[PDB]
Amino acid sequence: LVLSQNTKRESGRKVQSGNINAAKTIADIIRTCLGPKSMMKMLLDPMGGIVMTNDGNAILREIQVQHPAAKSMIEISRTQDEEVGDGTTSVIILAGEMLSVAEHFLEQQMHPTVVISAYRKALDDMISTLKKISIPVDISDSDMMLNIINSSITTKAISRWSSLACNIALDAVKMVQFEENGRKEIDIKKYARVEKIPGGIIEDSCVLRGVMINKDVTHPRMRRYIKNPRIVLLDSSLEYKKGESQTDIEITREEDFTRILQMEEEYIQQLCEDIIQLKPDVVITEKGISDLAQHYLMRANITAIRRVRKTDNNRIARACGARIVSRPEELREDDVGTGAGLLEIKKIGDEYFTFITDCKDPKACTILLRGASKEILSEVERNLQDAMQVCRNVLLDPQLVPGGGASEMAVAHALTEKSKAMTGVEQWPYRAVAQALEVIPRTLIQNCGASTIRLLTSLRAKHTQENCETWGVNGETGTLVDMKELGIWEPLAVKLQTYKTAVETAVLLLRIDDIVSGHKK
Amino acid sequence: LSVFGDRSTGETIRSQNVMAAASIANIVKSSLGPVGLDKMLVDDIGDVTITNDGATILKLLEVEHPAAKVLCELADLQDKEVGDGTTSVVIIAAELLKNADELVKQKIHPTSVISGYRLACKEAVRYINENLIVNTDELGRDCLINAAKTSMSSKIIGINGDFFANMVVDAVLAIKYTDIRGQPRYPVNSVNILKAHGRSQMESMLISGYALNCVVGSQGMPKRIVNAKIACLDFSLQKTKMKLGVQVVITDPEKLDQIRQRESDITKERIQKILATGANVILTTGGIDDMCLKYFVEAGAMAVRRVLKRDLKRIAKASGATILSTLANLEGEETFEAAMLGQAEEVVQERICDDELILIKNTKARTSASIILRGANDFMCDEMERSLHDALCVVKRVLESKSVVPGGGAVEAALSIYLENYATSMGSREQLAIAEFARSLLVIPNTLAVNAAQDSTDLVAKLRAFHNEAQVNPERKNLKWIGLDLSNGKPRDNKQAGVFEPTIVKVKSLKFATEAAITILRIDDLIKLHPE
Amino acid sequence: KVSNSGITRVEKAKIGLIQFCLSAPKTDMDNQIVVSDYAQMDRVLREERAYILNLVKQIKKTGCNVLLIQKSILRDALSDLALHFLNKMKIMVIKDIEREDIEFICKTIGTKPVAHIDQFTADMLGSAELAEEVNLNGSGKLLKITGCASPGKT
Amino acid sequence: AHWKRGMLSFVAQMHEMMNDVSPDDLDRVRTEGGSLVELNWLQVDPNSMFRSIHSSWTDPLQVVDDLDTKLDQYWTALNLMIDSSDLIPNFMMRDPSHAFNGVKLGGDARQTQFSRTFDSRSSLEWGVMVYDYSELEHDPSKGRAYRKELVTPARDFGHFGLSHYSRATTPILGKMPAVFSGMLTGNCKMYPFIKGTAKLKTVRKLVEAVNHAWGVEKIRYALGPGGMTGWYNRTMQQAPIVLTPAALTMFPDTIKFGDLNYPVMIGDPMILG
């Protein structure tokens, strides 16, 4: 007994093949799921719930494994998803297939390092390739973005509802631009709140010029409908709060006890008049609310909400532009809840909701999702999440790529052009990666279900002519289609990290030679 | 005759530890030299860890047998002394142990073996100084470029090294620091490194300053400051305490409001007092209250809570700030001075991988360097920084010692023969140990070649010959050379190839190896004892 | 290891050995401030700092530069506010000194300890030729005192 | 005696409030997440010695029959409601050794001086302490799905109906965490997290008392060799066995979420999805 006492170890080609095999599985289990003709998957969470979703990330984010590289592959999916959202429909399927041929030189007894060495060379040209075949686009033009978005969203079940989301995604995206960074304003998708409510229909869900609250007026006498209210964000509580120094009182005389009780009354009321002195209309706080003050604030006919979540308070603050306060005496009128086009609290059906509309030029907004069932809704927003995410990426770069595999073949021959001109042993890996690229349109064929081999050869044959690069594969006809008329258009950066991620996967798994278990720490 | 465990002696344990050591060697034999292959370990629950550096690997490897733990801890030390050679040093340890054991495995007196080994190390390093190459005459940036990319070899990032090494060398010359008044010591681990999955290392960026794995406390608070008004404050900002036991007793209710009032006003006035200085950036490892958050928003201020203690120390040394455990004065009143401020061009929190981390650009007081990591998975980044972590040290040592050693295993190539002749000097029986010492020392190129997977001996033989030739015709200025390659599988001039390593690496390596085998060799018997 | 962020090496150092804790005064017996009134707030705050300054103020007044502080784990240890002062006062400082060690300490350095402020005076202030914290192990840092005008046999 | 009764009354309120949940809100929170019950800590045993000095330790004991039986019932029932719905308590800790040393105490939690025992020298009136999960609760990136995967007890303790692991509390009353035995142990028995060696010192005066109240042969007669003093010192070494409910030694060791992700505060004990 020597080493680690029942911790398994393995080395070399068996390890190499094993990682090769598992990824082949890993990619394979999803190859059905990309494309406008994709499939859509529903999952068992371990604790009983159901998630039905086409986006691969969550699928893999909902996958438990034992082999490591799969879990290693797992994070790669979620990372690009996190950074890019979609392509997760494709990136891993690219990834394993890259590995799938990547093995093919292992029997060639070629040391992987060079094979890596070519890869880093390969990606460099690839990035250079796409930059050459990218297309900048105006960002002010809405319709192309809408076209881009549907081009971006005509892959998920909301396909039937492209018009709504495209504008829906655009509107919220546009209205989030925080210019205090000079002209380096940055949008946020955490101020892009998403609210899913069942019932109703997709058509009923809409972008709200403001915020929605799953709470109610503390007191009936406060009005449930106001045009141009003033809103207060009291970070502090509204009631008497501990004297923090383990304070103590020793009364001796009778009136003292009754005196002090008024004093807390007095202390609370004190707070009330400080509030009213700014003539506010709406009271919001993350903590509780004294009803006795709430009597006072009722007495002032000033709308009040208690115990509201902080992020919403920020978005509420970002809705009406006011700034939150924890100090009623130090409350400042520059944070008057002005920027409020309409105040209301509707009844959704068994739930009051808070309706805050028509801010002048709001920066925060929540999207109201009104559908059939939350798992349906949750599926929707994931697609929405991707939809909005790519748009900001479009707002981050105006340069666009034609997808549909068109770009893929473009590099493919381009590397082939590189390949033949780059004589040496490394040449064969170089073309092989190009050989790897061709599968994605091919995969698209199967999801359509067409004669993949013939179409692919023709497409490559089609893309042998330099005059045409937008020739790609239609989702439904399964026919060669120039993209310009087809309009499936994509952010270049989306494809960059795609290949960037893809190749990173390759090298990382390739240097592996060994497995060690049972760390026990 | 002892309970709860027996004993084994002599060859049985002798070989046993040898078997233990060789086991240790083969675990890491494949991750060394420009063609070594990095390891990975599933922990127990899937929190796996890919890495090439044995010191990590060993530290992450549970060990129960004694002698191996020596190597692992020894591996740790050289890491604490060099950082790599982890690629090599342990490999050295067992193999020299392997051959030395073999002599004793016949009859050979261990203490005799120790003594020659004692001389062998001393013999080696002396010639090491007799074969040294200095970097002072050489281009500083160039050789640092060379050794780094040499160090960058065997690592995940070796392809991009030129970018990386260039990035690295800038960092260290940006981590210049004046020592004891007579040294320009360059502090490692002072550089800030942040790992972030996502973009490629192509997009990984160095900070001409510091970067913070932190966020803005207040969403309403502003985000970017083009000014130098920067403070740090260990002193937390909450409603000030009695902080030991100090009871508050009221027999007169009439001032409790005033009591409760001032409870925060102290924090408030401290807010006001520091703000009146006009400071625009502050850190506090202590907690930060929302009352303060509100006040700073009114200031539109910039503040940080819960910052790690060391970084703000770097910040104060970087920005020229004074970290302040509190507000005070040589007079009793707690006062605050603008002179305590730290200064820098611009500070931004920026969302990389959708997470806003804070950036510091160009502290005028002391130039700073930090590096932002971009990669695919978290698995890739945390390993590559270790290489980066080791990347700094080696250059730091080169900065620490203005002298270089050519890489690619030339060392033992020269050593083996020079000792081989030197062995004949003693005339004792120890020169056999010297000979095995050299023989066992020959292991590295063999490991290289097997790691490169070709005919090793012939490469070795050629390496033997030219080095043997390097010991013929003392007109060696045009007969003394140095070098070997693996990618093309034939020897070269690593000096021309730029393949260089720091001298101290091998120096301590042999010595630490020398000590280790000495410890291991003298053992002759182990006794087991079962627990309670 | 040192407790000062900034003080690394000292020359011609004067060493003083101090026993009494440097923090808020705590009686060996149970004692407590009662808070019932207004100016209790600031005064206590200010007065304790004034308390520690004079501690620190007088200690500097001796002209010393190196502080040694033992464990006081039974009660309050050195206050950081005092450490703030010493860092402001640029004074070498050491916490966590073993009650067994001091005899060897004082035997070695020749600085009999001080357990009351008035007792603290430069006549007992030892001084050293040089003392500082070396750094080995890369970061394994060790405190060194070489050279004393009063040669201890230890 | 007072502590368990207050500990008894507190759980009943959460259990009461747990059962007063209408189905839809639990259905809604189970899917959406959010606060389900927040028991105002101002309501927590407001008349006992660990909340107000208007009480004292000498005060008449709140008359509760089947105290252990009811304590067993309400804990197990409450945990099953959490276990079945994987809910998130802000009053539970994976290792009560953390409550005294290592956790963050946040905001108003900071006055706490933990005596780790029940002695007259402690000031045992103290605030109701729970974790601050506000950052988790209002975090979109730590929404419903993430908390299920990480924060719920069964991740760290195992499923309440299928675990021997003890389940411990935040310092709810008297700054003393409770130690509840595992359901698979056969009962859900509650303990304060107090070391046996601290238990032993409660007799140190009495040991001395016997030293001056009894003759040595009489003391050696009844205590055996060594008398009480050697017994006391001997018992001190054996306190980890002889003064130790096992449940205080049956906490989980493989920790995934833990206790050090959020500070302990003074606040309302609450459960959210």
Side-chain angles (χ1 to χ4, degrees), chain A residues 456-474:
Chain A
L456 162 137
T457 46
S458 63
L459 159 55
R460 175 193 294 98
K462 160 58 49 71
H463 225 152
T464 50
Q465 168 52 241
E466 51 75 37
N467 187 27
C468 47
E469 279 54 64
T470 13
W471 273 103
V473 172
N474 160 280

PDB file of all heavy atoms in Angstrom, chain A residues 456-474:
ATOM      1  N   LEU A 456     -24.097  19.208 -49.567  1.00  0.00           N
ATOM      2  CA  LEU A 456     -22.853  19.727 -49.018  1.00  0.00           C
ATOM      3  C   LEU A 456     -21.783  19.844 -50.089  1.00  0.00           C
ATOM      4  O   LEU A 456     -21.122  20.882 -50.209  1.00  0.00           O
ATOM      5  CB  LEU A 456     -22.379  18.820 -47.887  1.00  0.00           C
ATOM      6  CG  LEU A 456     -20.913  18.955 -47.487  1.00  0.00           C
ATOM      7  CD1 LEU A 456     -20.775  18.951 -45.972  1.00  0.00           C
ATOM      8  CD2 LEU A 456     -20.095  17.831 -48.105  1.00  0.00           C
ATOM      9  N   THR A 457     -21.608  18.792 -50.885  1.00  0.00           N
ATOM     10  CA  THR A 457     -20.612  18.835 -51.943  1.00  0.00           C
ATOM     11  C   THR A 457     -20.895  19.985 -52.890  1.00  0.00           C
ATOM     12  O   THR A 457     -19.993  20.755 -53.240  1.00  0.00           O
ATOM     13  CB  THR A 457     -20.612  17.511 -52.697  1.00  0.00           C
ATOM     14  OG1 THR A 457     -21.966  17.140 -52.983  1.00  0.00           O
ATOM     15  CG2 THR A 457     -19.974  16.427 -51.854  1.00  0.00           C
ATOM     16  N   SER A 458     -22.157  20.135 -53.284  1.00  0.00           N
ATOM     17  CA  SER A 458     -22.545  21.247 -54.135  1.00  0.00           C
ATOM     18  C   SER A 458     -22.286  22.577 -53.453  1.00  0.00           C
ATOM     19  O   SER A 458     -21.800  23.518 -54.084  1.00  0.00           O
ATOM     20  CB  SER A 458     -24.020  21.127 -54.492  1.00  0.00           C
ATOM     21  OG  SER A 458     -24.802  21.211 -53.315  1.00  0.00           O
ATOM     22  N   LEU A 459     -22.628  22.683 -52.170  1.00  0.00           N
ATOM     23  CA  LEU A 459     -22.386  23.929 -51.457  1.00  0.00           C
ATOM     24  C   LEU A 459     -20.908  24.268 -51.466  1.00  0.00           C
ATOM     25  O   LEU A 459     -20.516  25.390 -51.807  1.00  0.00           O
ATOM     26  CB  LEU A 459     -22.897  23.826 -50.024  1.00  0.00           C
ATOM     27  CG  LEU A 459     -22.292  24.819 -49.024  1.00  0.00           C
ATOM     28  CD1 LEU A 459     -22.425  26.281 -49.462  1.00  0.00           C
ATOM     29  CD2 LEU A 459     -22.935  24.624 -47.665  1.00  0.00           C
ATOM     30  N   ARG A 460     -20.074  23.306 -51.086  1.00  0.00           N
ATOM     31  CA  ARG A 460     -18.642  23.495 -51.231  1.00  0.00           C
ATOM     32  C   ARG A 460     -18.312  23.832 -52.671  1.00  0.00           C
ATOM     33  O   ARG A 460     -17.603  24.804 -52.951  1.00  0.00           O
ATOM     34  CB  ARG A 460     -17.904  22.235 -50.793  1.00  0.00           C
ATOM     35  CG  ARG A 460     -16.412  22.299 -51.022  1.00  0.00           C
ATOM     36  CD  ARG A 460     -15.763  20.936 -50.876  1.00  0.00           C
ATOM     37  NE  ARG A 460     -15.840  20.421 -49.513  1.00  0.00           N
ATOM     38  CZ  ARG A 460     -16.753  19.552 -49.093  1.00  0.00           C
ATOM     39  NH1 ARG A 460     -17.674  19.097 -49.932  1.00  0.00           N
ATOM     40  NH2 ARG A 460     -16.744  19.137 -47.835  1.00  0.00           N
ATOM     41  N   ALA A 461     -18.875  23.065 -53.603  1.00  0.00           N
ATOM     42  CA  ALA A 461     -18.735  23.401 -55.010  1.00  0.00           C
ATOM     43  C   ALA A 461     -19.305  24.781 -55.291  1.00  0.00           C
ATOM     44  O   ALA A 461     -18.693  25.578 -56.010  1.00  0.00           O
ATOM     45  CB  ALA A 461     -19.425  22.347 -55.872  1.00  0.00           C
ATOM     46  N   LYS A 462     -20.471  25.087 -54.720  1.00  0.00           N
ATOM     47  CA  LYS A 462     -21.011  26.433 -54.852  1.00  0.00           C
ATOM     48  C   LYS A 462     -20.042  27.455 -54.289  1.00  0.00           C
ATOM     49  O   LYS A 462     -19.776  28.485 -54.918  1.00  0.00           O
ATOM     50  CB  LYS A 462     -22.370  26.532 -54.155  1.00  0.00           C
ATOM     51  CG  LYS A 462     -22.824  27.949 -53.789  1.00  0.00           C
ATOM     52  CD  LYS A 462     -22.916  28.889 -54.995  1.00  0.00           C
ATOM     53  CE  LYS A 462     -23.693  28.288 -56.156  1.00  0.00           C
ATOM     54  NZ  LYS A 462     -25.149  28.206 -55.878  1.00  0.00           N
ATOM     55  N   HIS A 463     -19.462  27.172 -53.134  1.00  0.00           N
ATOM     56  CA  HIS A 463     -18.580  28.154 -52.533  1.00  0.00           C
ATOM     57  C   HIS A 463     -17.162  28.084 -53.078  1.00  0.00           C
ATOM     58  O   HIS A 463     -16.311  28.864 -52.643  1.00  0.00           O
ATOM     59  CB  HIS A 463     -18.575  28.006 -51.012  1.00  0.00           C
ATOM     60  CG  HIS A 463     -18.675  29.311 -50.285  1.00  0.00           C
ATOM     61  ND1 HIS A 463     -19.236  29.426 -49.032  1.00  0.00           N
ATOM     62  CD2 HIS A 463     -18.291  30.560 -50.640  1.00  0.00           C
ATOM     63  CE1 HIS A 463     -19.189  30.688 -48.645  1.00  0.00           C
ATOM     64  NE2 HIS A 463     -18.616  31.396 -49.601  1.00  0.00           N
ATOM     65  N   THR A 464     -16.885  27.189 -54.030  1.00  0.00           N
ATOM     66  CA  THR A 464     -15.607  27.267 -54.724  1.00  0.00           C
ATOM     67  C   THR A 464     -15.491  28.539 -55.543  1.00  0.00           C
ATOM     68  O   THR A 464     -14.384  29.059 -55.706  1.00  0.00           O
ATOM     69  CB  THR A 464     -15.418  26.071 -55.649  1.00  0.00           C
ATOM     70  OG1 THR A 464     -16.588  25.910 -56.461  1.00  0.00           O
ATOM     71  CG2 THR A 464     -15.176  24.813 -54.848  1.00  0.00           C
ATOM     72  N   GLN A 465     -16.607  29.059 -56.042  1.00  0.00           N
ATOM     73  CA  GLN A 465     -16.589  30.322 -56.760  1.00  0.00           C
ATOM     74  C   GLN A 465     -16.413  31.467 -55.774  1.00  0.00           C
ATOM     75  O   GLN A 465     -17.182  31.598 -54.815  1.00  0.00           O
ATOM     76  CB  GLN A 465     -17.874  30.499 -57.560  1.00  0.00           C
ATOM     77  CG  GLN A 465     -18.056  31.902 -58.089  1.00  0.00           C
ATOM     78  CD  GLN A 465     -16.842  32.383 -58.840  1.00  0.00           C
ATOM     79  OE1 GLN A 465     -16.226  33.372 -58.465  1.00  0.00           O
ATOM     80  NE2 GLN A 465     -16.485  31.678 -59.904  1.00  0.00           N
ATOM     81  N   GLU A 466     -15.397  32.295 -56.011  1.00  0.00           N
ATOM     82  CA  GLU A 466     -15.138  33.421 -55.123  1.00  0.00           C
ATOM     83  C   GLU A 466     -16.232  34.472 -55.210  1.00  0.00           C
ATOM     84  O   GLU A 466     -16.409  35.256 -54.275  1.00  0.00           O
ATOM     85  CB  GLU A 466     -13.784  34.047 -55.454  1.00  0.00           C
ATOM     86  CG  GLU A 466     -13.590  34.383 -56.934  1.00  0.00           C
ATOM     87  CD  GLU A 466     -14.365  35.616 -57.382  1.00  0.00           C
ATOM     88  OE1 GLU A 466     -14.461  36.580 -56.595  1.00  0.00           O
ATOM     89  OE2 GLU A 466     -14.890  35.617 -58.516  1.00  0.00           O
ATOM     90  N   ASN A 467     -16.962  34.517 -56.323  1.00  0.00           N
ATOM     91  CA  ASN A 467     -17.892  35.613 -56.539  1.00  0.00           C
ATOM     92  C   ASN A 467     -19.013  35.629 -55.515  1.00  0.00           C
ATOM     93  O   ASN A 467     -19.660  36.665 -55.336  1.00  0.00           O
ATOM     94  CB  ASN A 467     -18.482  35.526 -57.940  1.00  0.00           C
ATOM     95  CG  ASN A 467     -19.326  36.723 -58.281  1.00  0.00           C
ATOM     96  OD1 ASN A 467     -19.116  37.814 -57.752  1.00  0.00           O
ATOM     97  ND2 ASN A 467     -20.292  36.532 -59.167  1.00  0.00           N
ATOM     98  N   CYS A 468     -19.236  34.523 -54.820  1.00  0.00           N
ATOM     99  CA  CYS A 468     -20.404  34.397 -53.968  1.00  0.00           C
ATOM    100  C   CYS A 468     -20.004  33.811 -52.627  1.00  0.00           C
ATOM    101  O   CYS A 468     -19.415  32.728 -52.567  1.00  0.00           O
ATOM    102  CB  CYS A 468     -21.452  33.516 -54.641  1.00  0.00           C
ATOM    103  SG  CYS A 468     -20.771  31.988 -55.320  1.00  0.00           S
ATOM    104  N   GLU A 469     -20.327  34.528 -51.556  1.00  0.00           N
ATOM    105  CA  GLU A 469     -20.013  34.081 -50.213  1.00  0.00           C
ATOM    106  C   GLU A 469     -21.233  33.977 -49.318  1.00  0.00           C
ATOM    107  O   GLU A 469     -21.170  33.290 -48.293  1.00  0.00           O
ATOM    108  CB  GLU A 469     -18.996  35.023 -49.556  1.00  0.00           C
ATOM    109  CG  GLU A 469     -17.554  34.776 -49.945  1.00  0.00           C
ATOM    110  CD  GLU A 469     -17.353  34.774 -51.437  1.00  0.00           C
ATOM    111  OE1 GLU A 469     -17.579  35.831 -52.060  1.00  0.00           O
ATOM    112  OE2 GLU A 469     -17.005  33.707 -51.987  1.00  0.00           O
ATOM    113  N   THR A 470     -22.348  34.597 -49.690  1.00  0.00           N
ATOM    114  CA  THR A 470     -23.545  34.585 -48.866  1.00  0.00           C
ATOM    115  C   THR A 470     -24.390  33.353 -49.115  1.00  0.00           C
ATOM    116  O   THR A 470     -25.464  33.218 -48.523  1.00  0.00           O
ATOM    117  CB  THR A 470     -24.384  35.843 -49.112  1.00  0.00           C
ATOM    118  OG1 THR A 470     -23.915  36.509 -50.297  1.00  0.00           O
ATOM    119  CG2 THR A 470     -24.281  36.791 -47.927  1.00  0.00           C
ATOM    120  N   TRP A 471     -23.915  32.444 -49.954  1.00  0.00           N
ATOM    121  CA  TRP A 471     -24.617  31.200 -50.213  1.00  0.00           C
ATOM    122  C   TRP A 471     -24.578  30.326 -48.972  1.00  0.00           C
ATOM    123  O   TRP A 471     -23.510  29.847 -48.575  1.00  0.00           O
ATOM    124  CB  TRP A 471     -23.977  30.477 -51.387  1.00  0.00           C
ATOM    125  CG  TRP A 471     -24.528  30.912 -52.662  1.00  0.00           C
ATOM    126  CD1 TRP A 471     -23.954  31.751 -53.557  1.00  0.00           C
ATOM    127  CD2 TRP A 471     -25.793  30.550 -53.197  1.00  0.00           C
ATOM    128  NE1 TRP A 471     -24.780  31.926 -54.638  1.00  0.00           N
ATOM    129  CE2 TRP A 471     -25.920  31.197 -54.437  1.00  0.00           C
ATOM    130  CE3 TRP A 471     -26.829  29.732 -52.753  1.00  0.00           C
ATOM    131  CZ2 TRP A 471     -27.042  31.055 -55.235  1.00  0.00           C
ATOM    132  CZ3 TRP A 471     -27.937  29.594 -53.542  1.00  0.00           C
ATOM    133  CH2 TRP A 471     -28.040  30.250 -54.770  1.00  0.00           C
ATOM    134  N   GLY A 472     -25.740  30.110 -48.370  1.00  0.00           N
ATOM    135  CA  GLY A 472     -25.841  29.247 -47.213  1.00  0.00           C
ATOM    136  C   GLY A 472     -26.965  28.247 -47.373  1.00  0.00           C
ATOM    137  O   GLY A 472     -27.502  28.085 -48.473  1.00  0.00           O
ATOM    138  N   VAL A 473     -27.353  27.593 -46.282  1.00  0.00           N
ATOM    139  CA  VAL A 473     -28.352  26.533 -46.316  1.00  0.00           C
ATOM    140  C   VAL A 473     -29.634  27.047 -45.685  1.00  0.00           C
ATOM    141  O   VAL A 473     -29.648  27.447 -44.513  1.00  0.00           O
ATOM    142  CB  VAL A 473     -27.866  25.270 -45.595  1.00  0.00           C
ATOM    143  CG1 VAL A 473     -29.005  24.268 -45.487  1.00  0.00           C
ATOM    144  CG2 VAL A 473     -26.689  24.673 -46.335  1.00  0.00           C
ATOM    145  N   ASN A 474     -30.710  27.016 -46.459  1.00  0.00           N
ATOM    146  CA  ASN A 474     -32.014  27.373 -45.939  1.00  0.00           C
ATOM    147  C   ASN A 474     -32.421  26.404 -44.841  1.00  0.00           C
ATOM    148  O   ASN A 474     -32.137  25.207 -44.904  1.00  0.00           O
ATOM    149  CB  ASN A 474     -33.049  27.349 -47.054  1.00  0.00           C
ATOM    150  CG  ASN A 474     -34.450  27.222 -46.532  1.00  0.00           C
ATOM    151  OD1 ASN A 474     -34.894  26.135 -46.199  1.00  0.00           O
ATOM    152  ND2 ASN A 474     -35.156  28.337 -46.451  1.00  0.00           N
TER     153      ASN A 474
END
